[PDB]
């Protein structure tokens, strides 16, 4: 059959029974850094079972009048196990990911979701002179959420969360140029993405630079008749792939 899968990494296993295919990045699978492209000249560390496993973030509730959520990707796993400890003691590091968003409902519910994974999502402030604060651009394993109305400009430091512009000043229907899948509750149950390492330098610092962003926004809202179960959650699991670090120093 085609609708069944199984993903095994480390000591974790993910099984699905209703699914589409796997979207693989820009056509490329993640892999370690070659000896032609490296610049740091001391040996990296590769734990390879301790960090490359499935980490489950916090669930959120899909209400009827909801707008969307986002996560910043090398920041959500900053306090998750031995991935979060290697990010502190090391100065560099490159990583690819495997993202598996899962949301199930019955044959009597309706809905649709768009699961994109955008690189370099620089977001805009609400006041036109300033830039947003760090605690409102991201959060450890917590979803920052869009709004169906426009943030008032008299606020001091906020992110503009008008959903139809996606926070970056762009038409939100044009977001399908990035690698993406749809969760359609008529036919689908989950969405899987495999993303390689996309950056303009071969290695980068992992605390000052968030180089991926996962956006989940409902194009067709959730609806059901009275008598069905009203609580529908969404759960995101992210597993690093081929991670390696360099330049050991103090904790921070």
């Amino acid at each position: 059959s085609d609708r069944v899968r199984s993903i095994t990494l480390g000591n974790s296993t993910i099984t699905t029974q209703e699914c589409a295919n796997v979207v693989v990045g820009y056509g490329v699978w993640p892999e370690y850094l070659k000896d032609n492209e490296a610049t740091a000249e001391d040996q990296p560390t590769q734990p390879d079972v301790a960090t490359c496993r499935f980490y489950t973030l916090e669930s959120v509730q899909w209400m009827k009048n909801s707008a969307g959520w986002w996560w910043k990707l090398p920041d959500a796993l900053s306090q998750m196990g031995l991935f979060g400890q290697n990010m502190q003691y090391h100065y560099l590091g490159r990583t690819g990911y495997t993202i598996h968003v899962q949301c199930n409902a019955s044959k009597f519910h309706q809905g649709c979701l768009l699961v994109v994974c955008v690189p370099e999502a620089e977001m805009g402030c609400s006041n036109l002179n300033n830039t947003p604060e760090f605690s409102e651009l991201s959060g450890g394993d917590s979803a920052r959420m869009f709004t169906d109305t426009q943030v008032g400009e008299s606020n001091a430091k906020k992110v503009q969360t008008a959903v139809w512009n996606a926070g970056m000043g762009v038409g939100v229907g044009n977001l399908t140029i990035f690698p993406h899948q749809w969760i359609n509750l008529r036919t689908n149950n989950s969405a899987t993405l495999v993303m390689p390492y996309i950056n303009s330098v071969p290695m980068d610092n992992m605390f000052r630079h968030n180089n991926l962003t996962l956006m989940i926004i409902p194009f067709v809202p959730l609806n059901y008749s009275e008598g069905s179960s009203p609580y529908v959650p969404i759960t995101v699991t992210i597993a690093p792939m081929c991670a390696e670090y360099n330049g050991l120093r103090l904790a921070s």
Partner: antibody
Amino acid sequence: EIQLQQSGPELVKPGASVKVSCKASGYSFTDYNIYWVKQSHGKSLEWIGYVDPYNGNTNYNQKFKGKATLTVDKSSSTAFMHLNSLTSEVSTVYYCARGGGYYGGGYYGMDYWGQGTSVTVSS
Amino acid sequence: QIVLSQSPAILSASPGEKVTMTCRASSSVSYLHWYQQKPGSSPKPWISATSNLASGVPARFSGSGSGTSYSLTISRVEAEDAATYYCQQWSSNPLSFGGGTKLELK
């Protein structure tokens, strides 16, 4: 509009019981939880518990575990709360609020409160 | 168990200045909301999930902070907010409340 409407204030005797109400109208009743808090005449707020109207799973505080019981009636979209063993320190007011589903979906918080019934304990 | 240590006990300010009111928790919480109760009325939902201003709230109110330290800040004190302000958490620990700092005009 979304409106939550409660009953009128009563008085009871020590050792008695009283059932308060919170009628919800203006929206679909089984979609959201209903939280119950109390406000003392001089102190801050305290949480009693909540109830899910879809299946009736009641959760409670550790202080009010045996002295309060919440129930629901889906056919009329009202919520009830039964208070056991009324005491001396409960010259307070009881509120009902509409929530989201408790930490899966509390991002709007407790977004629609009621008027509040004030009960007294006297002879 | 989460205890919300809302500080100070009481605040006072002349009309037309900037005030700051803080709340610190025992650990990290998922959400944080603030309410306003005028004495003799039900508490109204003010600023929710640490930043978002509610419906009908004037734009002179602000809230920020993360980690374990939160705050609420009125930019210019107008005359129609002589009330008390409570603070609520929504973590996996059951529920808590702040303690109600009172704001009256000097």
